[PDB]
Design a protein around this ligand. Structure first.
Ligand code: APC
Ligand code: CL
Ligand code: MG
Ligand code: MG
Length: 158
């Protein structure tokens, strides 16, 4: 299966956090990285004074079950960051979100795939399009056709 994972960081030098996360992602069992998008800069969306975020997407080949992949991405977040309660509302060292798990639809307490809001997030869609321009969502919509609406500015590189 190919899983598409969103990576975001806006704390403790985001490029360091993202490159460190890539190394950890490459160490997930029964899996390996196929490709990684360019790195995109996303200004804060709103009034809060937070650092710019670095956003990217990774295509990971894996024979793990979706829940097993999530185990590993959560583990990486917990191990790499100086994890804080306050990261839920402020700057955050690392966020690894499973955007897509192959063509599968998962609706469970722990795990919802496709990511519930990704179709509203240019900082997810644009890096995904860079690595998977031919992608079609489980609901049959083409990624290219979503972006061709021009509803999402193509983000600047990091
Ligand atoms: N597709 C998915 N990828 C990652 N976590 C997911 C997920 N679907 C559900 N979750 C759940 O989301 C929980 C909270 O994760 P958080 O990273 O704190 C949310 P977030 O990424 O800050 O918000 P967002 O999902 O709006 O981007 C996880 O513990 C996990 O159980
Ligand atoms: Cl879908
Ligand atoms: Mg997130
Ligand atoms: Mg998350």
């Amino acid at each position: 299966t190919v899983a598409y994972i969103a990576i975001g960081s806006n704390l403790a030098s985001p490029l360091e956090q993202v490159n460190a996360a890539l190394k950890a992602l490459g160490d997930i069992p029964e899996s390996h990285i196929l490709t990684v998008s360019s790195f995109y800069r996303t200004p804060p969306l709103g009034p809060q004074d937070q650092p710019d975020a670095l956003n990217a997407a990774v295509a990971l080949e894996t024979s793990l079950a979706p829940e097993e992949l999530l185990n590993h991405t959560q583990r990486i977040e917990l191990q790499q960051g100086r994890v804080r309660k306050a990261e839920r509302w402020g700057p955050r060292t690392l966020d690894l979100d499973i955007m897509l798990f192959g063509n599968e639809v998962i609706n469970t307490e722990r795990l919802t795939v496709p990511h519930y809001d990704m179709k509203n997030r240019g900082f997810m869609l644009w890096p995904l399009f860079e690595i998977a321009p031919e992608l079609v969502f489980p609901d049959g919509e083409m990624l290219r056709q979503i972006l061709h609406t021009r509803a999402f500015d193509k983000l600047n590189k990091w």
